[PDB]
Tab-separated table of N, CA, C and O in Angstrom:
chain	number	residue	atom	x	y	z
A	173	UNK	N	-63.389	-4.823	-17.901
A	173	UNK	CA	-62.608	-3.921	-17.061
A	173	UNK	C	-61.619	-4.689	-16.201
A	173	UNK	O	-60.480	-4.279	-15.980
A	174	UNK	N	-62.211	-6.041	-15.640
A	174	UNK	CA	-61.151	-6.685	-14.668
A	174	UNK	C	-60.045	-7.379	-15.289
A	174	UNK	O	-58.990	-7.591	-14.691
A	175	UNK	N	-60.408	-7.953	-17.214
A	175	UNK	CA	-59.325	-7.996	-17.430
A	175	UNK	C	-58.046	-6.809	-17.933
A	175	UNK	O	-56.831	-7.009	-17.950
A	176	UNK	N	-58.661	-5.771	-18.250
A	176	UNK	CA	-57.690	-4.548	-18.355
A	176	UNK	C	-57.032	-4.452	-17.030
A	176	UNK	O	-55.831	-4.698	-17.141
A	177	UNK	N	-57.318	-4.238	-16.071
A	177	UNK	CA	-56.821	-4.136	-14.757
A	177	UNK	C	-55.871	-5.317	-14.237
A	177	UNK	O	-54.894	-5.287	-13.489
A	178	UNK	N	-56.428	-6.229	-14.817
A	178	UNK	CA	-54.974	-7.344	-14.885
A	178	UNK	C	-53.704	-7.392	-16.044
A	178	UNK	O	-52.657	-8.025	-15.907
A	179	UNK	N	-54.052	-6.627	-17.107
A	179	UNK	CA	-52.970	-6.050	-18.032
A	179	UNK	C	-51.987	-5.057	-17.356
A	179	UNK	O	-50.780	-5.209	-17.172
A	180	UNK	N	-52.817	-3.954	-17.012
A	180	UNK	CA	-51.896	-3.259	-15.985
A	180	UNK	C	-51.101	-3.563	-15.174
A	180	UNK	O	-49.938	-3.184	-15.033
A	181	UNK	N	-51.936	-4.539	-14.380
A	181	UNK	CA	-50.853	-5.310	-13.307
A	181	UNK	C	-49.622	-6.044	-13.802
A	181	UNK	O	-48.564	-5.982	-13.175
A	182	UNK	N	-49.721	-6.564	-14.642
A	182	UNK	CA	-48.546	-7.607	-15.709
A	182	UNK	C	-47.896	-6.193	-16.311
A	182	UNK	O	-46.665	-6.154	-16.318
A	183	UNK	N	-48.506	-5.206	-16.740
A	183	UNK	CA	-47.301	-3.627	-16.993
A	183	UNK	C	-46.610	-3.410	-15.768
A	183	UNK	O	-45.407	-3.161	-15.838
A	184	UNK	N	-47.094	-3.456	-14.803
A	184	UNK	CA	-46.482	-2.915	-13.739
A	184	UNK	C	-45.464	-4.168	-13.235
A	184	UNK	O	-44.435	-3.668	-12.781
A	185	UNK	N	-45.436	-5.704	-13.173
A	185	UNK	CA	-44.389	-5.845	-12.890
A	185	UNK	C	-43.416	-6.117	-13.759
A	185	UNK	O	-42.248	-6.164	-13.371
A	186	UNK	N	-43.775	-6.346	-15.133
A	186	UNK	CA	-43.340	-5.651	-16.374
A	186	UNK	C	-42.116	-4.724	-15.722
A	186	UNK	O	-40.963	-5.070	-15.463
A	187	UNK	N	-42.764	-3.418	-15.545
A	187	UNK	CA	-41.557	-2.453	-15.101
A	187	UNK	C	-40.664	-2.580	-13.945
A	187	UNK	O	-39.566	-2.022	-13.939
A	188	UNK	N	-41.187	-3.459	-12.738
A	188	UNK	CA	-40.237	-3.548	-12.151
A	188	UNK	C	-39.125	-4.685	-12.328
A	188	UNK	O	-38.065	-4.709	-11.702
A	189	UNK	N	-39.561	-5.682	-13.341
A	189	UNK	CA	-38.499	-6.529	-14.034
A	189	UNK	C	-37.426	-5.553	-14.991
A	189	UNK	O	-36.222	-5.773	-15.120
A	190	UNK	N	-38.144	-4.501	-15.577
A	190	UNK	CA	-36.531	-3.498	-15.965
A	190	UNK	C	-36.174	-3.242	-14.625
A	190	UNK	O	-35.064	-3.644	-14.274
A	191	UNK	N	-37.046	-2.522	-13.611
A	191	UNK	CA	-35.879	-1.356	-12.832
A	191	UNK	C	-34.603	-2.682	-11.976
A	191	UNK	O	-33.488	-2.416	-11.529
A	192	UNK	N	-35.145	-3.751	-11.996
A	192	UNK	CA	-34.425	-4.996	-11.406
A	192	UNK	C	-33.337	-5.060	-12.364
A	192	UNK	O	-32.223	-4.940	-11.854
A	193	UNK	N	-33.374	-5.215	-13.582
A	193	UNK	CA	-32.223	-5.057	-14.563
A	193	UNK	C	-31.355	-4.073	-14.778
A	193	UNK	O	-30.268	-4.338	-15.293
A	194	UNK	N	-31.815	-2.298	-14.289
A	194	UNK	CA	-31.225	-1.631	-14.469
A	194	UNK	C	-30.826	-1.636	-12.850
A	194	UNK	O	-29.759	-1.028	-12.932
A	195	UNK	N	-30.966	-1.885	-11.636
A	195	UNK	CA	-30.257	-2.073	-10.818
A	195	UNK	C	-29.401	-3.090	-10.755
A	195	UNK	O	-28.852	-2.745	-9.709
A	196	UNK	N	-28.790	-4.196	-11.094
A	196	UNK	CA	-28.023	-4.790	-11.803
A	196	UNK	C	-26.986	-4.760	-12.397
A	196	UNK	O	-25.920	-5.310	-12.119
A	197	UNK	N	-27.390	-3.799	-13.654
A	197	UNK	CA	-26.215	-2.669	-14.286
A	197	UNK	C	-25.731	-1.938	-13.311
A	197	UNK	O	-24.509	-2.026	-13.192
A	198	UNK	N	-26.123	-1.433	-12.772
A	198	UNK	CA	-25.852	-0.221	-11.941
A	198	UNK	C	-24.914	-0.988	-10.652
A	198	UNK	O	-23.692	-0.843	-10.700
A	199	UNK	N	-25.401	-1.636	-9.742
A	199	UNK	CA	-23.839	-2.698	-9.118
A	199	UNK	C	-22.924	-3.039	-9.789
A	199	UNK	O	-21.823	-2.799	-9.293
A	200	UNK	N	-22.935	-3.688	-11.093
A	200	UNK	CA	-21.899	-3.719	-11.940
A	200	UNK	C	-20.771	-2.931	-11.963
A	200	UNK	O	-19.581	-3.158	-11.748
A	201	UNK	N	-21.736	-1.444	-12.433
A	201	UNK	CA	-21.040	-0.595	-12.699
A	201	UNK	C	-20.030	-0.308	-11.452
A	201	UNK	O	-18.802	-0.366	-11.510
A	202	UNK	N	-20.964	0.072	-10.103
A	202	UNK	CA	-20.494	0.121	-9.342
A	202	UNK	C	-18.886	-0.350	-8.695
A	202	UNK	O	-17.890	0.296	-8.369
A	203	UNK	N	-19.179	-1.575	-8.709
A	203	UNK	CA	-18.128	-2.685	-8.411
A	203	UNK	C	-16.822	-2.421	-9.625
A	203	UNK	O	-15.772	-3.054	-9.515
A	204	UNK	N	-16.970	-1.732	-10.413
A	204	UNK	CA	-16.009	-1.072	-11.815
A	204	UNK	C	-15.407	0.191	-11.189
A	204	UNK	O	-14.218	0.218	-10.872
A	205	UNK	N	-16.136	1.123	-11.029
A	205	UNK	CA	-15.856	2.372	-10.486
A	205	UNK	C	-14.557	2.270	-9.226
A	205	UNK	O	-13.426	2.734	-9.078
A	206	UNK	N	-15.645	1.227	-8.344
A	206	UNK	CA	-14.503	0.808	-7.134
A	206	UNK	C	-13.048	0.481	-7.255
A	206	UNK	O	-12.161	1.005	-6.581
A	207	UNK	N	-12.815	-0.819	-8.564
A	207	UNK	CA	-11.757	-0.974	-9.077
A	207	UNK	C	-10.881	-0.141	-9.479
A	207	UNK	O	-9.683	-0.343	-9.279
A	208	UNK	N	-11.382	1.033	-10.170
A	208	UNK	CA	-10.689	2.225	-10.940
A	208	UNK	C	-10.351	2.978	-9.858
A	208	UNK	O	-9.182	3.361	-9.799
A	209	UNK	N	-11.244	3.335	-8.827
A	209	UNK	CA	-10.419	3.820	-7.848
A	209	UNK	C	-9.192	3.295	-7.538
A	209	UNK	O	-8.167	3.922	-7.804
A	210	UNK	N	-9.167	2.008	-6.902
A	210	UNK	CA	-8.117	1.237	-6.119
A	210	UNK	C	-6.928	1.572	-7.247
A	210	UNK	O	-5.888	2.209	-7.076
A	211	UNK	N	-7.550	0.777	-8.736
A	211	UNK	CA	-5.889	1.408	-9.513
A	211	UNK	C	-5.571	2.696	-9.314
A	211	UNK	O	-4.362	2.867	-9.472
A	212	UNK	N	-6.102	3.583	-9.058
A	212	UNK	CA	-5.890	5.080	-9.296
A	212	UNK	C	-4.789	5.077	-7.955
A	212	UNK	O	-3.614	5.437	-8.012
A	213	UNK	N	-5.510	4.571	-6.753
A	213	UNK	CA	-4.532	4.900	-5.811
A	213	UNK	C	-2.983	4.040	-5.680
A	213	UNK	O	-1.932	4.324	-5.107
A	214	UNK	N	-3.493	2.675	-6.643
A	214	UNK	CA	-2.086	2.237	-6.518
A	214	UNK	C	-1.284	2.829	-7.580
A	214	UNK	O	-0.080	2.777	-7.331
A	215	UNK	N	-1.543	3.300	-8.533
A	215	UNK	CA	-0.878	4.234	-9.317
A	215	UNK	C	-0.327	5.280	-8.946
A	215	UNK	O	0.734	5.676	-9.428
A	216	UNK	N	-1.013	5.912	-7.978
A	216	UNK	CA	-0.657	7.091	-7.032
A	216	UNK	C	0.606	6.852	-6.053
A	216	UNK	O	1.452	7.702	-5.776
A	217	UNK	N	0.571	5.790	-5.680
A	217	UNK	CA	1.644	5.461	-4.842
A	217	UNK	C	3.088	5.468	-5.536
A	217	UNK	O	4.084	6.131	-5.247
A	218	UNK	N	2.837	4.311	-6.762
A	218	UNK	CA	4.102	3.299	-7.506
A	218	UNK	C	4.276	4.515	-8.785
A	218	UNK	O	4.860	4.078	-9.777
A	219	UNK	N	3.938	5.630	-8.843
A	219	UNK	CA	4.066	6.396	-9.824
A	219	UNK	C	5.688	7.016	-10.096
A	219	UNK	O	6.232	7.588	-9.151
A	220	UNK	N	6.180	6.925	-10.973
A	220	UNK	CA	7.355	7.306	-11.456
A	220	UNK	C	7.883	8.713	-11.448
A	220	UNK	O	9.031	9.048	-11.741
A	221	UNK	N	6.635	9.695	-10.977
A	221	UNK	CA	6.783	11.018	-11.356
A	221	UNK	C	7.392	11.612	-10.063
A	221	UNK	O	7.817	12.743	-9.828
A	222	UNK	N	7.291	10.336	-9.182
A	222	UNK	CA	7.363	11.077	-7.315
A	222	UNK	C	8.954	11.332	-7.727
A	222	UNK	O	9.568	10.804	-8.654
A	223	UNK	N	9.520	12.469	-6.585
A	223	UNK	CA	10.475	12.148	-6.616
A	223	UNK	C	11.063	12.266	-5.304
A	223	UNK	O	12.263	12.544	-5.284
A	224	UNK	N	10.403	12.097	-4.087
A	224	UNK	CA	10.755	12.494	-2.780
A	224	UNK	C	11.559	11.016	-2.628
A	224	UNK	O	11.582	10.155	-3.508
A	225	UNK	N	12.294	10.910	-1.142
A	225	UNK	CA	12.596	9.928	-0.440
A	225	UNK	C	13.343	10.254	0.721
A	225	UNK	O	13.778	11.406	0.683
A	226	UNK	N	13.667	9.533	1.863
A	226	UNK	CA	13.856	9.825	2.862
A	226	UNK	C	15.123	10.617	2.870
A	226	UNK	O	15.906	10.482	1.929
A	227	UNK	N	15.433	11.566	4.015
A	227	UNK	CA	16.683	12.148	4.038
A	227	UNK	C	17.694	11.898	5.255
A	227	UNK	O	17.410	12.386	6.349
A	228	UNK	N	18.669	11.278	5.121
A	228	UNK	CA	19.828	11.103	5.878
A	228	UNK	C	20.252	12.270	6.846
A	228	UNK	O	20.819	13.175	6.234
A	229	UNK	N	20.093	12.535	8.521
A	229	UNK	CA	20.646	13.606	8.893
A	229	UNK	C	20.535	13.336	10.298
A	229	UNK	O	20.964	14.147	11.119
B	197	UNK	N	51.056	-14.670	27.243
B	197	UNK	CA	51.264	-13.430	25.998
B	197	UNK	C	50.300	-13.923	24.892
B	197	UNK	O	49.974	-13.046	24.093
B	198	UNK	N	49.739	-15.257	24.674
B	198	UNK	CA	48.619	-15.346	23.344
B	198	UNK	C	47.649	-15.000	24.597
B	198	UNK	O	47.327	-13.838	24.351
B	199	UNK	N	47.181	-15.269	25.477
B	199	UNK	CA	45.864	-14.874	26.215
B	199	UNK	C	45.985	-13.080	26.237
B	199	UNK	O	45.058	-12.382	25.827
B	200	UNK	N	46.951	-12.649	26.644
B	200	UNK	CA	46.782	-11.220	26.673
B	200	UNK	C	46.756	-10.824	25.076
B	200	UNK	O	46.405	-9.720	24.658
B	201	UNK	N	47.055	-11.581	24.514
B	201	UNK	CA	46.504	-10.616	22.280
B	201	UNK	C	45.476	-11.143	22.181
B	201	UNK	O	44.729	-10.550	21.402
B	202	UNK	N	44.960	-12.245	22.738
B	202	UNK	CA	43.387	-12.555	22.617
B	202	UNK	C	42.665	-11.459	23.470
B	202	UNK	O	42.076	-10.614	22.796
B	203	UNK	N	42.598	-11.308	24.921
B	203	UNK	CA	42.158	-10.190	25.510
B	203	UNK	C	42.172	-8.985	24.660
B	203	UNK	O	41.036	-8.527	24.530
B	204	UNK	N	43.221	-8.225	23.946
B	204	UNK	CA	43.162	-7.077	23.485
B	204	UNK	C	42.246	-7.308	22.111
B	204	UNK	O	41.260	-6.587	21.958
B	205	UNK	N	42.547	-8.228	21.197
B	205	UNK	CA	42.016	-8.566	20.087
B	205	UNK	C	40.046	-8.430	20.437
B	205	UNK	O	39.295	-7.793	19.699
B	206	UNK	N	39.711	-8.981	21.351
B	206	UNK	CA	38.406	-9.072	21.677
B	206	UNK	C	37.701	-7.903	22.326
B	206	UNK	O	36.491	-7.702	22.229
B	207	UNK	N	38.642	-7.070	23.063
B	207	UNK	CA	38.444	-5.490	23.568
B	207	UNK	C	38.118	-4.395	22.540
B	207	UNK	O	37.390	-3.413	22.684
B	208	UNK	N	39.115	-4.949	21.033
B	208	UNK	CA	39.612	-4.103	19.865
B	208	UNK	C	38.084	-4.268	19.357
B	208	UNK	O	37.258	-3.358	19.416
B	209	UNK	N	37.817	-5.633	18.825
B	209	UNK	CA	36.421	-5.630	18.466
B	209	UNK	C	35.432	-5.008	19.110
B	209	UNK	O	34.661	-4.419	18.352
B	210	UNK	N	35.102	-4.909	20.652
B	210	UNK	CA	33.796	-4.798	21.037
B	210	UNK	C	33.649	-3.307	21.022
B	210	UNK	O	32.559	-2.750	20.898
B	211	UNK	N	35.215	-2.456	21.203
B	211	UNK	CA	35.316	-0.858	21.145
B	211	UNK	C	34.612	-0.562	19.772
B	211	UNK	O	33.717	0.271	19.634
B	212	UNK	N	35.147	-1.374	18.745
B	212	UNK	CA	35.328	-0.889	17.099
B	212	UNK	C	33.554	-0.952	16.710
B	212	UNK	O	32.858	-0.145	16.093
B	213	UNK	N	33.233	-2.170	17.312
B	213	UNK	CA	31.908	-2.996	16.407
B	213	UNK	C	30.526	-1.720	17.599
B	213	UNK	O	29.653	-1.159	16.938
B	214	UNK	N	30.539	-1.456	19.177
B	214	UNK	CA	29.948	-1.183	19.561
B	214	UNK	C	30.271	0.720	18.734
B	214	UNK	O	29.305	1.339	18.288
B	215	UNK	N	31.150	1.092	18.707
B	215	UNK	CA	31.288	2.781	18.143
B	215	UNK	C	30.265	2.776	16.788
B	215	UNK	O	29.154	3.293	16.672
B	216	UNK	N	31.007	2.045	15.871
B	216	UNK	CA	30.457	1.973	14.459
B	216	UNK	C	29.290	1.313	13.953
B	216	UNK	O	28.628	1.525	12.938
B	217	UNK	N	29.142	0.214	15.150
B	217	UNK	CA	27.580	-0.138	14.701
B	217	UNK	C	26.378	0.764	15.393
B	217	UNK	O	25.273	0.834	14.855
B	218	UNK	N	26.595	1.250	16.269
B	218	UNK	CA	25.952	2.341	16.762
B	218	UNK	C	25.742	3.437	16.277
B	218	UNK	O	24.680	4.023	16.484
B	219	UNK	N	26.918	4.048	15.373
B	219	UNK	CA	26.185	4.813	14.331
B	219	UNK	C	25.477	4.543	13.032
B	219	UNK	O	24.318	4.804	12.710
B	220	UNK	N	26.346	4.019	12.429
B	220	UNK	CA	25.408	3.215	11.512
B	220	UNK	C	23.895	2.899	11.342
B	220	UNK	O	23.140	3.339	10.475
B	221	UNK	N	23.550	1.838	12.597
B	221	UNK	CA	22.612	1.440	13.103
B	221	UNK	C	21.337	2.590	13.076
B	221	UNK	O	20.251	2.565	12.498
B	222	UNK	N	22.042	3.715	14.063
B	222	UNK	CA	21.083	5.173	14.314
B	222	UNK	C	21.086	5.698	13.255
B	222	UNK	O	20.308	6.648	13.338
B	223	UNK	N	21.619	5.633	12.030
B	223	UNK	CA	21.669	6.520	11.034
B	223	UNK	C	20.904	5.589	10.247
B	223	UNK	O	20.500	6.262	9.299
B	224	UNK	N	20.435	4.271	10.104
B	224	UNK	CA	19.359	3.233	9.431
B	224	UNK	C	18.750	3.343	10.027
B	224	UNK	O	17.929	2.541	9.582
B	225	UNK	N	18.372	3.681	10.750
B	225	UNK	CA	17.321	3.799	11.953
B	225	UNK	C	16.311	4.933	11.475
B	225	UNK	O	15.139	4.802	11.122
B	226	UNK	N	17.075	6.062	11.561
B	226	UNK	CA	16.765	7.792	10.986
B	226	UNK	C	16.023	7.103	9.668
B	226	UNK	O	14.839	6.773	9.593
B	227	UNK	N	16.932	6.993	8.768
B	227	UNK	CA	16.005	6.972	7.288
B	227	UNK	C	14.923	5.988	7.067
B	227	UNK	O	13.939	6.277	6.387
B	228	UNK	N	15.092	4.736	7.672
B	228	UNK	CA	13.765	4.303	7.903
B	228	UNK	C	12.969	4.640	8.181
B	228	UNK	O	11.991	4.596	7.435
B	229	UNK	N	12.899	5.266	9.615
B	229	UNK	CA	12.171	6.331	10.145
B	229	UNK	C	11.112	7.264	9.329
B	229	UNK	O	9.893	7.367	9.464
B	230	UNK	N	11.849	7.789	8.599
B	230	UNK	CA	11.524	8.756	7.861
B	230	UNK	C	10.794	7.950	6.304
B	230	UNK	O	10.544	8.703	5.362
B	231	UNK	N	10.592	6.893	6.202
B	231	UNK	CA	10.301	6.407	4.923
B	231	UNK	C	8.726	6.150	4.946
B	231	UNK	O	8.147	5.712	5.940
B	232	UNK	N	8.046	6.495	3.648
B	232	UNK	CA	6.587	6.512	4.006
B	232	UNK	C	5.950	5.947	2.526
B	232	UNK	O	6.602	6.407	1.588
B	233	UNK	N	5.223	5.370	2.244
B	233	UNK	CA	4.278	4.736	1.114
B	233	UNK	C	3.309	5.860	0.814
B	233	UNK	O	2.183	5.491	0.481
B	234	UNK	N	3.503	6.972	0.861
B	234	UNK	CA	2.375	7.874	0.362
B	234	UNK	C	2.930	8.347	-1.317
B	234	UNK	O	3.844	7.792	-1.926
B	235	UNK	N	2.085	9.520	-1.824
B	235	UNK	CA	2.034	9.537	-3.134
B	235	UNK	C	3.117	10.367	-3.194
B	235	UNK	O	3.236	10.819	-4.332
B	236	UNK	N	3.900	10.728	-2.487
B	236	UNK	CA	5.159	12.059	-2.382
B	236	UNK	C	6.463	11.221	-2.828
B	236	UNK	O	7.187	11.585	-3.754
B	237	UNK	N	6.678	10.057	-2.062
B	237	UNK	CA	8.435	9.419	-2.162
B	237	UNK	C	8.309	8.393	-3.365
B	237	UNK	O	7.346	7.693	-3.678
B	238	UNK	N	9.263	8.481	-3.809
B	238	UNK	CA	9.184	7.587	-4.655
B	238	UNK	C	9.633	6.300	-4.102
B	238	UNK	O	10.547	6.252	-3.279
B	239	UNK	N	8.846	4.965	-4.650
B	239	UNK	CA	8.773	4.167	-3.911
B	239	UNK	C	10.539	3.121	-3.910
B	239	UNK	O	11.132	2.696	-2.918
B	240	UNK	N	10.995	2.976	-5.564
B	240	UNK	CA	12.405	2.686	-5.389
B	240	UNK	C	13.199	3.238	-5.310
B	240	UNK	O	14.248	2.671	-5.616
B	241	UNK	N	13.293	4.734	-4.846
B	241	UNK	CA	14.104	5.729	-3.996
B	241	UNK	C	14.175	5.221	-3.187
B	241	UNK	O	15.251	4.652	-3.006
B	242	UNK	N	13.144	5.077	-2.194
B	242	UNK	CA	13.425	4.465	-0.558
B	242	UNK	C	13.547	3.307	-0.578
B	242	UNK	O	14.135	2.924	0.434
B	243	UNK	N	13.254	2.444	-1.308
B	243	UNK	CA	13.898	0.619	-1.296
B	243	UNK	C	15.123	0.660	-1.375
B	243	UNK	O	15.858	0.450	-0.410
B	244	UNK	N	15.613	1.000	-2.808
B	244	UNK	CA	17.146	1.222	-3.234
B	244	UNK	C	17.938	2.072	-1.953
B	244	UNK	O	18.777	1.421	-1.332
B	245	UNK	N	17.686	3.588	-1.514
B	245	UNK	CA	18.483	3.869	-0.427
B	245	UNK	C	18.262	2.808	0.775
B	245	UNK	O	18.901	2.918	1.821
């Protein structure tokens, strides 16, 4: 029984060596998302479609 | 008579340069003013003007 109960234990940090890997991915990702924002807004700015600009008066 | 066309010559300027750079000036002034980096103006619209 005490060595089953030490199998378990080696499952269990077993699993928290994935959730450590899938948190990992997941900053990754994160730190991606962030980027895509920032282009989005500098795209937003430098975009070709604007067509305002200041008015003389 | 050259000191008095220098006198007028230097009067001529400060009338001419203080009228016209003063508007000018306020009228670069205005559109600067008015110039903004948001997603509305286009950005070499307001460089170029």
């Amino acid at each position: 029984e005490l060595q089953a109960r030490i199998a378990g234990e080696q499952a269990a940090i077993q699993n928290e060596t994935t959730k450590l890997q899938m948190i990992a991915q997941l900053r990754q990702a994160e730190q991606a998302l962030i980027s895509e924002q920032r282009r989005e807004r500098n795209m937003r700015i430098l975009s070709s479609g604007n067509q305002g600009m200041p008015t003389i008066q | 008579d050259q000191w008095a066309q220098q006198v007028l010559n230097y009067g001529l300027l400060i009338v001419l340069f203080a009228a016209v750079f003063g508007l000018l000036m306020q009228i670069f002034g205005s559109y600067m003013a008015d110039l903004r980096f948001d997603g509305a103006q286009n950005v070499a619209y307001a460089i170029g003007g």
